[PDB]
Design a protein around this ligand. Structure first.
Ligand SMILES: *[C@@H]1O[C@H](CO)[C@@H](O[C@@H]2O[C@H](CO)[C@@H](O[C@@H]3O[C@H](CO[C@H]4O[C@H](CO)[C@@H](O)[C@H](O)[C@@H]4O)[C@@H](O)[C@H](O[C@H]4O[C@H](CO)[C@@H](O)[C@H](O)[C@@H]4O)[C@@H]3O)[C@H](O)[C@H]2NC(C)=O)[C@H](O)[C@H]1NC(C)=O
Ligand SMILES: *[C@@H]1O[C@H](CO)[C@@H](O[C@@H]2O[C@H](CO)[C@@H](O[C@@H]3O[C@H](CO[C@H]4O[C@H](CO)[C@@H](O)[C@H](O)[C@@H]4O)[C@@H](O)[C@H](O[C@H]4O[C@H](CO)[C@@H](O)[C@H](O)[C@@H]4O)[C@@H]3O)[C@H](O)[C@H]2NC(C)=O)[C@H](O)[C@H]1NC(C)=O
Ligand SMILES: *[C@@H]1O[C@H](CO)[C@@H](O[C@@H]2O[C@H](CO)[C@@H](O[C@@H]3O[C@H](CO)[C@@H](O)[C@H](O)[C@@H]3O)[C@H](O)[C@H]2NC(C)=O)[C@H](O)[C@H]1NC(C)=O
Ligand SMILES: *[C@@H]1O[C@H](CO)[C@@H](O[C@@H]2O[C@H](CO)[C@@H](O[C@@H]3O[C@H](CO)[C@@H](O)[C@H](O)[C@@H]3O)[C@H](O)[C@H]2NC(C)=O)[C@H](O)[C@H]1NC(C)=O
Ligand SMILES: [Cl-]
Ligand SMILES: [Cl-]
Ligand SMILES: [Cl-]
Ligand SMILES: [Cl-]
Ligand SMILES: [Cl-]
Ligand SMILES: [Cl-]
Ligand SMILES: [Cl-]
Ligand SMILES: [Cl-]
Ligand code: NA
Ligand code: NA
Ligand code: NA
Ligand code: NA
Ligand code: NA
Ligand code: NA
Ligand code: NA
Ligand code: NA
Lengths: 388, 388
């Protein structure tokens, strides 16, 4: 009567501490009822590893809480998938990236920030790259007991940016007598802590003029989710204190247009702040920095991501021998890196949205799937071909 | 008998401290002898400012040593040029960027470096962007009195990179008990100093596996001179400790080829080191980082620069009325952003290497110039048109 279809698939990412453990679930319909098999996304079947990974009932793959000593990479840093299968054929779920992280001490640092008097300053909370997936800045604190939270600007001067930095307008020599520490939160342990070091502004008096200079290391391409607020920085120091202008390149050209500042898109000193991000905010942005001595510019690439989904039209069709079978994968999300097709769990080497079988023979019956992928996400849709 | 030609032009950059002062020289031939006028490159004539800028004899523009209090931006941060002129017409020299910098205290910092045991580490000497044009790393020093200089690797482990960082192979927990300071040199004052802070490696024990992660901020496009050694870094941390591969994109494509390691081009852990750089080393490079968990990559753009020069063929020609006059600008150097032509000191709106005057009329006699420019350098060539 029916080939398998997924009712419930596990999400693309399962991140958890060794204390929390995890369970992921896969449910499929069909007639006869499909067997549910857990595999590594590569295709190997996976089994029971005592205390670490348990195929449970209800179709649940269970990662019990475990001691640091019992960490196993092949179990705990692994991409899994669910394979649903009956006599009519096989479907494979989206990828399931499992990352069990053993609770472990980390610290964030705040270093000295050297600035020319009169310029803006950006104080950064430095989170080691290998924990940064799990740690975010909550708030900023000074020795004089000022506390700054994400939201509005304080005293026309201090702003905690959406990207976590503390932005300070128009630094004066008095600003060198404060030190700054950030509070960070680890989303897998739920713990918060203050930074191990405190940072201060070191203010240089402007005695010589100088053209704006930007740092050697600049923001690599960004990927940020729709509906969130984005901030693009443009760090630069010079004397006279420079002014800042943002542009967005016209895609595929060397031509650019001035970013249009309004209710949604605002500029704070050299920082561009985009609220309620939409996919069309993606692109290459250029910040141009000027004073009466000279100018400089830096490019930043932004991709605003949206969740991947896929659906095949039609869900099932019956086609008489020798006639054509067409399946159309319809998808949403951003970016889409690839579209690719599978038949009963095996790649069939077609990478376009519409799959056409010219003349249906007997071994063309079975389950077909469309997968849409980018670097972080995957989504699948399935469909059945029956012979008439 | 002759229009002006330059014998000696000032260099593109004149950087000097207020204690040193400076003089720049312009010499041109011609008959009658041309008057030498100093202008701002924009075209305004410049005069004597008592104690700060003196048109001297010998055709020298002199910036005397001066007190910090007497700094003047319009004098001391300015692009000048030499205008040579007689009855036959005018030529203007290449741009002369003058930067008088008042001697002023700076400090470099070395911060904590967080690394996973078994990975490579890179210790950086942080030089404020607004003095970095003048300050370079000389050497690195530890508390245990180890001294490291540019050149060869020490003990198979420590290397001071051409770009100034201290590279450390395969960090072990014992490496956390040393602290590091850099010695820097200011090329305008000639002073050396040690860094204000010392940095240490903070070593994280690998308890969980993790895919390689690279920092948020990455090297922006580089410009480095021919014949020097270049190092391209690829900072990355993960567990297992990752391996590194470098590629160079085929220009104008998304295709890449593996960099070929030999006597000139070497790899030290994740660092690519190119000796005796040539202009053909320019391009977009990709570093790909892998371990058994995952991978990442980062792009770096390199331009290898070569000094600009220009020459017009022919230096002088006589052309009878109504006939065609052709001047051909021949140039060398890299990159070349623009080529543009002038006649007696005024832009004539032609931006190609060959200038063709279709039918020579009377007001076409005069001095012609070709300018070749990029963001950092300019070179000019001149030629005379005489009527027959
Ligand atoms: C604020 O600060 C920024 C600096 O970051 C300044 O913006 C720069 O302005 C300069 C000067 O106008 C720009 O340089 C100009 O670019 C033109 C475009 O080049 C294109 O075409 C060539 C081929 O001919 C390609 O090589 C190139 O990649 C581009 O595709 C050039 O045509 C200009 O050269 C001509 O004019 C100059 C005078 O300006 C002459 O000296 C030349 O001989 C030639 O005739 C010129 O090089 C630069 O590109 C801008 N950068 C950016 C990032 O925008 C702002 O000007 C500054 N604001 C103020 C008020 O000063
Ligand atoms: C070391 O680490 C690096 C990671 O940094 C790995 O290199 C990456 O490898 C992956 C996997 O092969 C690469 O992803 C693949 O890229 C292909 C090329 O995409 C082009 O064409 C599409 C349009 O179809 C464009 O969107 C895109 O911009 C490119 O122009 C894709 O075709 C691949 O998808 C197909 O195969 C995969 C299985 O690999 C299926 O899941 C898909 O459904 C589809 O059928 C795939 O996405 C990635 O690009 C590499 N990155 C870099 C920087 O090189 C190394 O693999 C790793 N080494 C080892 C040994 O693991
Ligand atoms: C997950 O992994 C970590 C192992 O790093 C486990 O947390 C660690 O648990 C030990 C023992 O429970 C903790 O040691 C204790 O510290 C307190 C002082 O704060 C002391 O009074 C106790 O006698 C004991 O020595 C250790 O601090 C803790 N480490 C961290 C970073 O939290 C955790 O138990 C594991 N989860 C399991 C096995 O379910
Ligand atoms: C160029 O500009 C700087 C101004 O910043 C001048 O250097 C400064 O000169 C003053 C006076 O010569 C120095 O002060 C002295 O310091 C010593 C102690 O080290 C003290 O014994 C003296 O009595 C005096 O107070 C100052 O240190 C120095 N600053 C720097 C950064 O070098 C310089 O003279 C100027 N050049 C000229 C005017 O030609
Ligand atoms: Cl979902
Ligand atoms: Cl297998
Ligand atoms: Cl396994
Ligand atoms: Cl938000
Ligand atoms: Cl020269
Ligand atoms: Cl004038
Ligand atoms: Cl002036
Ligand atoms: Cl060198
Ligand atoms: Na069926
Ligand atoms: Na704007
Ligand atoms: Na179908
Ligand atoms: Na999905
Ligand atoms: Na003449
Ligand atoms: Na290689
Ligand atoms: Na000529
Ligand atoms: Na030159």
């Amino acid at each position: 009567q029916k080939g398998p279809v997924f009712l419930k698939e596990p999400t693309n990412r399962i991140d958890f501490s060794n204390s929390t453990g995890a369970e992921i679930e896969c449910k499929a319909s069909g007639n006869p009822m499909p067997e549910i098999i857990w595999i590594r996304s590569d295709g190997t079947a996976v089994g029971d590893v005592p205390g670490l990974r348990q195929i449970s009932s209800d179709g649940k793959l269970v990662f019990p809480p475990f001691r640091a000593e019992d960490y196993r990479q092949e179990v705990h840093a692994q991409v899994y998938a669910c394979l649903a299968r009956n006599q009519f054929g096989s479907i494979i779920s989206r990828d399931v990236h499992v990352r069990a992280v053993v609770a472990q001490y980390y610290e964030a640092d705040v270093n000295k920030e050297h600035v020319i008097r009169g310029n803006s300053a950006v104080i950064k909370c430095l989170i080691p790259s290998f924990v940064a997936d799990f740690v975010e800045v909550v708030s900023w604190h000074t020795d004089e007991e000022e506390n700054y939270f994400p939201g509005a600007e304080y005293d026309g001067k201090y702003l905690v940016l959406p990207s976590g930095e503390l932005h300070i307008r128009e630094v004066g020599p008095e600003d060198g007598y404060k030190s700054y520490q950030c509070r960070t939160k680890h989303r897998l342990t739920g713990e918060t802590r203050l930074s191990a070091t405190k940072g201060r502004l070191v203010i240089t008096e402007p005695i010589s003029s100088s053209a704006p200079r930007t740092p050697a290391l600049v923001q690599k391409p960004l990927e940020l989710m729709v509906a969130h607020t984005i901030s693009l920085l443009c760090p630069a120091q010079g004397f006279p204190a420079p002014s800042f202008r943002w542009y967005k390149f016209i895609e595929g050209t060397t031509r650019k247009q001035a970013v249009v500042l309004n209710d949604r898109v605002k500029q704070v000193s050299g920082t561009l702040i985009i609220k309620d991000a939409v996919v069309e905010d993606s692109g290459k942005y250029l910040c141009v920095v000027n004073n009466s001595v000279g100018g400089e510019s830096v490019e930043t690439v932004l991709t605003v991501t949206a969740p991947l989904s896929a659906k095949i039209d039609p869900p099932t069709q019956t086609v008489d021998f020798g006639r054509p079978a067409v399946f159309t994968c319809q998808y949403t999300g951003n970016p889409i890196k690839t579209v690719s097709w599978m038949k009963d769990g095996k790649a069939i080497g077609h990478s376009e949205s519409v799959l056409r079988i010219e003349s249906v023979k007997k071994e063309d019956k079975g389950m077909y799937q469309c997968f849409v992928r980018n670097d972080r996400e995957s989504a699948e849709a399935s469909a059945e071909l029956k012979l008439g």
